[PDB]
Design a protein around this ligand. Structure first.
Ligand SMILES: CCCCCCCC/C=C\CCCCCCCC(=O)O[C@H](COC(=O)CCCCCCCCCCCCCCC)COP(=O)([O-])OCC[N+](C)(C)C
Ligand SMILES: CCCCCCCC/C=C\CCCCCCCC(=O)O[C@H](COC(=O)CCCCCCCCCCCCCCC)COP(=O)([O-])OCC[N+](C)(C)C
Ligand SMILES: CC(C)CCC[C@@H](C)[C@H]1CC[C@H]2[C@@H]3CC=C4C[C@@H](OC(=O)CCC(=O)O)CC[C@]4(C)[C@H]3CC[C@]12C
Ligand SMILES: CC(C)CCC[C@@H](C)[C@H]1CC[C@H]2[C@@H]3CC=C4C[C@@H](OC(=O)CCC(=O)O)CC[C@]4(C)[C@H]3CC[C@]12C
Ligand SMILES: CC(C)CCC[C@@H](C)[C@H]1CC[C@H]2[C@@H]3CC=C4C[C@@H](O)CC[C@]4(C)[C@H]3CC[C@]12C
Ligand SMILES: CC(C)CCC[C@@H](C)[C@H]1CC[C@H]2[C@@H]3CC=C4C[C@@H](O)CC[C@]4(C)[C@H]3CC[C@]12C
Ligand SMILES: CC(C)CCC[C@@H](C)[C@H]1CC[C@H]2[C@@H]3CC=C4C[C@@H](O)CC[C@]4(C)[C@H]3CC[C@]12C
Ligand SMILES: CC(C)CCC[C@@H](C)[C@H]1CC[C@H]2[C@@H]3CC=C4C[C@@H](O)CC[C@]4(C)[C@H]3CC[C@]12C
Ligand SMILES: CC(C)CCC[C@@H](C)[C@H]1CC[C@H]2[C@@H]3CC=C4C[C@@H](O)CC[C@]4(C)[C@H]3CC[C@]12C
Ligand SMILES: CC(C)CCC[C@@H](C)[C@H]1CC[C@H]2[C@@H]3CC=C4C[C@@H](O)CC[C@]4(C)[C@H]3CC[C@]12C
Ligand SMILES: CCCCCCCCCCCCCCCC(=O)O
Ligand SMILES: CCCCCCCCCCCCCCCC(=O)O
Ligand SMILES: CCCCCCCCCCCCCCCC(=O)O
Ligand SMILES: CCCCCCCCCCCCCCCC(=O)O
Ligand SMILES: CCCCCCCCCCCCCCCC(=O)O
Ligand SMILES: CCCCCCCCCCCCCCCC(=O)O
Ligand SMILES: CCCCCCCCCCCCCCCC(=O)O
Ligand SMILES: CCCCCCCCCCCCCCCC(=O)O
Ligand SMILES: CCCCCCCCCCCCCCCC(=O)O
Ligand SMILES: CCCCCCCCCCCCCCCC(=O)O
Ligand SMILES: CCCCCCCCCCCCCCCC(=O)O
Lengths: 617, 36, 35, 617, 36, 25, 36, 25, 36, 35
């Protein structure tokens, strides 16, 4: 597109966001929608049954109160938008002042940008590590603090899994072993129970609307299957997996077990910290450990094909980069593209929206792939989906658009700065502004109340706001960071568009974190090292792309990637341990203080029925 | 970082926003004046 | 089509200046009150 | 050089090795030399005060007996020469059959060679790991099994280092902490004592030869300094370093401490396994921990300069690559280079020998640098010296010779295969054959007996055979592995020269390991992962050099380095833990068996005075 | 010596290939088989 | 895909013998 | 607005450089100083 | 080398101000 | 590896060493015959 | 110089064949006895 298309599109995206905020201001004041817009307060139990003033209110809660109110993962996520402003605001300013002889100017700027970015990341990594350590030290007792998950318990002809686990731990951790719970494959039973719930909803639907005999018959048949299955899963030795949740008397002991190799064969008796019981992805505990290697290989191949085939939708969007491509793809638009105003509106918004729609189901696919791979916790599944999404964006959204563009790399990049700018305004600015309306929950909330509610108690189930969406949010931020770092030395006018995005997204999400979103698991910012690593990868990619465009002076261009990686290793050595190792001293302090505070705690009673598959509880 | 960032924002809006906004005002008026 | 197009040209020619001044001041005033 | 120079040089190096073996056969049968040639048996206490039959004898001891006789490190080292034959024998054969259309033939061969090498390395890594685990399980009680070294104990205004250490461990490891010994800086005292010993040797020398008053005066003056220094080092609080050797009641506890982070600050209270007391490089325990970072940086810079300045000696040797360079450098040779026979002898041997002499002091320099860096054990110092030597050979012996050659990379490499061949025959074949004579120990042994012996007891001190020399031996093997992998696809006639070297070196060193060398420390093949890593680096280097020579088909050439590294990561995950983690189960088994076997062991008495600087003992 | 030696090598060397090929075939089969 | 892999493996063994016989002689 | 703004940036931006330069100078001095 | 580094640091600060003034305007 | 390697060594020396050694014998004799 | 050079040419011309045969057999015999 051209400058006037950027101008027209910006005018429209600004006005559109403004309108969404007006609609929001109206909907949030209608009392029948409080259960949707203030869901967090209902979940906490703190709430009973101009127009942009919500912005200042979102900013009034101190970060420490937000950590206790919303959780640490929610706060650390939000700080990523803040990181974006810290990294790019001075880049946008210096790039403008200096770049808007030339060969060397570009090299110097590349160093200035890399150093600033690394400096900011170093400071952020230190900050997050300190928040994590304090958060964990003050964290309330929870079963995972004492529990490790043992995988690949070797077989024995005579002894059961339970006997092997009890014996191993009494012998090798004799002072602290307390109790264990063996993993059971109850996937069939769990599916029958979920199916029964769906059938029950249909029966309740038809009863409120009054087919009744049909749904009753399905309920009785499934109830019989459930009863039969409960007997078989409980007394069937093949339902027992060679895995167990092992609990210890102290946190110190659990830390020792979780952080050390137990046997001489490094692939057996594998120990890791257990997920909090609500963070356990129970279905994947039924996957035999040894199959995980093959499953990951298959998904790497499936990912290749997904990335490969998706090139076609990208090429389509790039065809639409010109007005001729637009009318050829959509001939019905010819009558309105002679008009200068509409030509700019369509040229701006159409390829932006088309790409956004094609990518709409991408995170569902990636989450399915992640589940196939066998991860056993919700937090791990979201981190892997974020990983794959990031790679996908690097190849299909960024490089493929640039290459396809040239088909319709050095020169190819500057030619697409405009495309990425209109994309950011549609996906970024208008995108987050519409998210605050949160239309999907309003619609589902009202449909449930209208047809699936028999009692007011059901209205507390209709209220499921979801969560921040680490797996769909983090990859968007990272794409914009990459575009910023790539375009900053060549087309600096891109940067103000990402700065508006980071600022707007920060205020919109801070609002949603406080009033709307729940948190499904608390990983205490365990994801931070991945966020850090992705930024480092983005710096390296930008530096290599610059070599191609600028040209090769090679020792300067080569040193940038080397120095950037050396920085990364410094940080892994110095800050990463706050996320991947649990100091024995810290474990001992919690144990000491807890004992003094609660001298009569029955720890075994507390932990004994934790980690029992919910279908049995 | 937060204190320095906040000062920069206050200084920008107090002193440079006016002429920046004036240019946007003119650009919009001109665009529409020249259409149709 | 023409009714609208003329209404738009007229809005901007006569009322945009006042609207723009109100928006300009509102922004400056907003930031001045945040901290 | 040319083919007839290779032929003549081989005839001479073969004959020379033969002659060295004849001389050896004579010297080893003279009874006054038994204390030199059979030193290992005297050290064990098993010996009292054609002609090539020693070869079959060297091969008669079963590997398991050699492990108990010589030690595991000595056996694993020897197996490296065996690894060389396993990797290269089939390469030499296939390269000859296939290489002695062409573009693709070279790519296929590169894959065949890489795969075979990786396969062999995988199997070796498994084998070494199993030997290490069995060796350690059966190892006799030794103080380091229960001891960890704590570094960077943080300061405290009120408490001493000893008090801080005792408190920290009683609180965080309350069940097993047994005792500790604080590190003292006694470097001045230790130097005075060593100086006194040197003065005493001079006094004994002059007394046997009969200046006497002079040496007596020096002994009395130094004795006074020693007495005064002992009082000051013992009662001087600044002699106490923030470090300690901490011992535990069980091996299990020491393993837990050694393998875990102790405090939230990852740079403080650092814990690692203690070296065996005889493997402690006591002088470097006096280096404040924080200075180690700067010291390593300085040595990386010093290494750069060493590598850089050494280019000149390399260039000199390459000048001597031609007969004109030889006579210009040494005009006195003109009268004998017209003779065809001598022309070949000089052309072959002279640049070989000249390079060997220039590099003669290189390992002393590298060991000095390694000591400067602050490593605290003998085994660590030898591993670092080997590392630096390897890099030095890659840059100064291999690449610099090739580049300098061209000055007097693709084409440059084939042109030097002949140089490397004559170098191998002089450095390799003739080299190890002369080492068996072991002339330096004969000379020093006899000079000590003639002039510094007053009593027959002194003859047990004259007998110091040294050790295998990991830091000078391993880098030679690795250079030849690199030359093999680099030249195998281009000039296969090089390979038979390294095969003879590996075979000859194996038999000569097996003999020396059994009859001559002592072992200064037992690291139970802890060095293996470094040996493995160097071979992988050599594979990658060869593959990249091939791309340059052969030409770019690029996906095949690119995949080789990628796949080679993927193999390396597999091995790190699967075999490396046998060398870098101590399973808790293994520790528990040793503790259980020991207690049952020796129910009345006073472990505290055993460990309490271990790790006391020898100058005080 | 070389003409005969190279042929001797071809056969001596080839002798070990057939069983290696069989082991590789099984290794792949088993690697994927563990999936089910 | 077991039904395709098994004969594919057999075809590859023959492909190797042929390619190497061509390189060798 | 741009000519004045760019100059305002030069001064606003430059304002923070002098003390940064001093901190970097000390950081190097101290890094090496720990050696002795 | 403390006696050379201190004034070197001062020279570098001036070198930076000069280079950037040239790039900036 | 050890058993197969040992067989290859025994087979080489028993069968191919003779003609390989004969060529070396001839090469040495010829070299000296042609000198001086 | 000539005394030696003639002695060397003569050694090889008349005695090398016997020496070479002894060496050849010694090697084959050696390997045959190792295992
Ligand atoms: C770049 C990738 C990096 C990833 C690392 C992967 C590593 C993990 C690997 C393998 C993992 C699988 C484990 C299962 C164990 C089976 C292994 C076994 O015992 O046998 C071995 C197979 O082992 C192998 O894998 C080697 C095969 C390569 C040679 C091809 C050329 C053919 C020449 C034949 C000509 C026939 C035609 C004439 C017919 C008339 C037997 O090997 P070989 O073939 O006897 O010896 C040749 C050796 N050179 C010369 C090649 C040196
Ligand atoms: C490739 C290497 C990778 C290794 C990673 C190393 C990472 C570890 C690093 C540093 C480790 C040392 C720790 C000690 C703390 C001191 C840090 C502090 O508070 O101040 C900061 C210094 O921090 C810095 O280190 C940044 C300096 C780069 C900018 C140079 C351009 C000059 C423009 C000036 C023009 C003056 C001329 C006009 C005069 C009339 C203050 O920074 P700033 O300069 O205010 O902000 C500019 C930001 N951009 C635009 C550059 C984005
Ligand atoms: C339509 C949009 C563009 C209007 C909203 C713009 C601003 C009012 C927002 C967006 C981003 C915000 C900032 C994001 C992050 C922080 C960090 C926070 O500081 C901390 O508590 C931690 C500081 C640290 O990192 O050390 C205080 C407020 C501040 C400066 C924020 C103040 C308000 C800002 C400037
Ligand atoms: C002048 C020189 C060239 C004459 C000496 C030649 C040979 C008699 C030597 C050199 C290398 C030796 C080999 C080196 C290593 C081993 C492994 C060793 O086997 C094991 O115990 C472990 C096997 C494994 O790796 O699994 C048995 C003997 C053997 C084949 C050796 C037998 C004797 C060899 C062929
Ligand atoms: C008050 C604050 C917080 C909100 C400001 C919103 C609007 C006015 C801002 C946000 C980003 C801006 C754009 C960024 C870059 C350029 C390129 C230049 O060549 C012409 C104007 C143009 C196209 C800008 C126009 C105004 C803009 C659309
Ligand atoms: C003239 C003014 C008001 C216009 C605003 C643009 C420029 C000059 C402003 C906007 C935000 C500012 C930054 C905010 C925070 C920090 C962190 C500190 O460690 C070094 C300076 C630094 C990096 C500032 C440098 C100048 C800056 C880049
Ligand atoms: C981080 C917070 C404070 C919100 C976003 C800050 C930045 C990206 C926004 C706020 C207002 C914007 C400006 C408003 C008007 C104009 C006039 C036009 O002719 C060129 C660009 C220019 C000068 C814009 C550049 C970007 C801008 C400075
Ligand atoms: C009996 C065994 C164990 C010992 C054998 C020692 C001798 C005879 C061997 C070892 C390596 C061999 C050399 C390796 C490669 C070549 C290249 C070819 O174009 C001519 C002969 C030549 C130069 C060989 C001559 C004989 C040689 C010197
Ligand atoms: C005709 C004969 C006697 C001449 C000798 C040369 C060739 C054919 C010999 C010498 C040493 C031999 C190797 C010794 C050990 C092994 C390990 C096994 O896992 C696969 C085969 C393999 C790799 C052999 C292949 C053939 C080989 C390379
Ligand atoms: C590993 C052990 C058995 C020792 C070393 C093995 C190899 C490298 C040695 C042993 C004897 C050698 C051979 C002896 C004689 C000749 C004749 C010449 O015209 C070409 C090379 C050739 C054919 C040699 C090649 C290399 C050789 C096969
Ligand atoms: C509350 C926001 C009000 C926004 C009012 C403006 C919306 C109408 C579209 C304006 C487009 C201006 C295009 C300028 C042309 C150019 O960039 O050169
Ligand atoms: C004057 C009030 C500003 C606030 C209202 C937002 C108006 C946004 C208009 C879209 C940007 C068009 C600017 C084009 C500038 C130019 O290219 O000259
Ligand atoms: C469809 C064409 C084939 C190529 C597709 C890309 C496959 C990449 C595979 C890379 C190796 C993956 C190693 C996984 C290790 C593990 O299982 O943890
Ligand atoms: C159409 C172009 C296709 C390009 C595909 C590139 C993406 C390759 C996907 C495999 C990456 C796997 C990296 C390893 C991650 C892990 O260890 O889990
Ligand atoms: C320049 C165009 C090609 C794009 C692909 C370049 C690949 C660069 C990868 C750099 C990764 C650096 C390490 C990041 C941290 C981590 O993943 O652990
Ligand atoms: C191979 C060359 C790599 C060189 C890598 C240079 C980057 C080192 C970064 C170190 C920053 C240390 C700053 C102090 C931080 C702190 O501990 O407070
Ligand atoms: C016990 C070892 C006996 C060795 C006897 C031979 C030593 C004399 C030198 C022989 C050189 C032969 C050169 C051949 C020329 C050529 O390579 O073409
Ligand atoms: C015949 C007895 C062999 C054992 C004695 C070792 C003789 C080594 C001679 C040096 C190698 C010369 C061979 C040159 C062969 C050629 O190039 O034709
Ligand atoms: C003499 C010219 C200058 C360049 C000389 C080479 C210096 C290389 C330094 C690489 C970074 C070393 C980082 C060391 C980290 C550590 O101290 O452990
Ligand atoms: C090809 C000429 C240039 C030579 C330099 C190439 C550098 C290749 C380095 C490969 C290292 C691979 C990793 C080895 C294992 C390790 O060090 O941990
Ligand atoms: C990015 C591509 C990397 C692909 C790396 C391929 C090399 C994998 C090697 C695995 C060998 C496994 C053989 C079984 C060994 C065993 O456990 O017994």
């Amino acid at each position: 597109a051209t400058l006037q298309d950027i101008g027209v599109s910006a005018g429209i995206n600004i006005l559109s966001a403004f309108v969404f905020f007006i609609i929001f201001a109206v909907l949030r004041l209608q009392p029948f929608n409080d259960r949707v817009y203030f869901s967090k307060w209902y979940l906490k139990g703190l709430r009973s049954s101009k127009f942009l003033n919500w912005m200042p209110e979102a900013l009034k809660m101190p970060e420490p109160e937000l950590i206790d109110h919303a959780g640490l993962d929610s706060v650390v996520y939000l700080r990523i938008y803040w990181l974006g402003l810290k990294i790019f605001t001075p880049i946008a300013v210096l790039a403008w002042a200096v770049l808007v002889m030339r060969f060397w100017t570009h090299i110097v700027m590349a160093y200035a940008f890399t150093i600033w970015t690394c400096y900011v990341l170093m400071k952020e990594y230190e900050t997050i590590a300190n928040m994590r350590l304090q958060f964990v030290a003050s964290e309330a007792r929870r079963p995972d603090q004492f529990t490790v998950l043992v995988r690949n318990v070797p077989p024995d002809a005579d002894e059961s899994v339970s006997e092997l686990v009890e014996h191993f731990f009494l012998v090798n951790h004799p002072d602290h072993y307390l109790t264990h719970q063996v993993v059971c494959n109850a996937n069939k039973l769990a599916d029958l129970v979920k199916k029964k719930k769906k059938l029950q909803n249909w029966l309740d639907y038809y009863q409120l609307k009054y087919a009744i005999e049909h749904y009753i018959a399905e309920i009785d048949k499934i109830s019989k299957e459930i009863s039969k299955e409960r007997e078989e899963v409980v007394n069937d030795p093949k339902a027992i997996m060679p895995a167990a949740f092992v609990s210890f008397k102290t946190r110190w002991a659990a830390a020792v077990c979780a952080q050390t190799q137990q046997t001489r064969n490094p692939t057996q008796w594998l120990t890791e910290w257990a997920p909090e019981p609500r963070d356990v992805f129970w279905s994947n505990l039924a996957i035999p450990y040894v199959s995980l290697t093959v499953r990951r290989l298959i998904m790497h191949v499936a990912f290749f094909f997904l990335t490969f085939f998706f090139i076609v939708p990208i090429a389509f969007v790039q065809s639409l980069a010109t007005i001729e491509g637009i009318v050829k793809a959509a001939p019905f638009l010819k009558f309105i593209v002679d008009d200068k105003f509409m030509k700019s509106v369509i040229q701006g918004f159409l390829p932006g929206i088309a790409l956004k729609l094609f990518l709409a189901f991408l995170p569902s696919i990636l989450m399915i792939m992640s589940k196939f791979e066998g991860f056993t916790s919700i937090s791990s599944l979201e981190r892997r989906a974020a990983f794959r999404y990031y790679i996908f964006n690097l190849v299909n959204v960024f490089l493929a658009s640039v290459i396809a563009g040239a088909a319709f790399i050095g020169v190819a990049i500057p030619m697409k700065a405009t495309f990425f700018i209109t994309y950011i305004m549609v996906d970024g600015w208008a995108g987050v502004a519409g998210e605050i309306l949160m239309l999907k929950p309003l619609i589902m909330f009202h449909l449930k109340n209208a047809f699936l509610v028999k009692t007011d108690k059901d209205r507390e189930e209709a209220m499921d706001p979801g969560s921040i969406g680490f797996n769909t949010g983090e990859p968007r931020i990272q794409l914009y960071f990459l575009l910023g770092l790539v375009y900053a030395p060549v087309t600096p006018m891109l940067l103000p568009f990402i700065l508006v995005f980071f600022a707007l997204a920060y205020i919109v999400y801070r609002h949603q974190i406080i009033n709307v979103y729940n948190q499904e698991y608390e990983s205490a910012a365990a994801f931070w090292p991945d966020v850090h690593g992705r930024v480092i990868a983005a710096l390296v990619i930008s530096q290599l792309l610059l070599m191609g465009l600028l040209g090769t002076a090679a020792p300067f261009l080569i040193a940038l990637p080397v120095l950037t990686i050396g920085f990364h290793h410094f940080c892994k050595g110095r800050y990463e341990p706050a996320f991947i190792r649990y100091p024995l001293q810290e474990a001992m302090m919690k144990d000491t203080l807890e004992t003094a505070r609660e001298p009569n705690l029955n720890l075994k009673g507390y932990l004994q029925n934790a980690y029992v598959h919910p279908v049995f509880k | 970082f937060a204190e320095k960032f906040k000062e920069a924002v206050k200084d920008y809006f107090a002193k440079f926003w006016d002429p920046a906004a004036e240019k946007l005002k003119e650009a919009v008026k001109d665009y529409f004046a020249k259409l149709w």
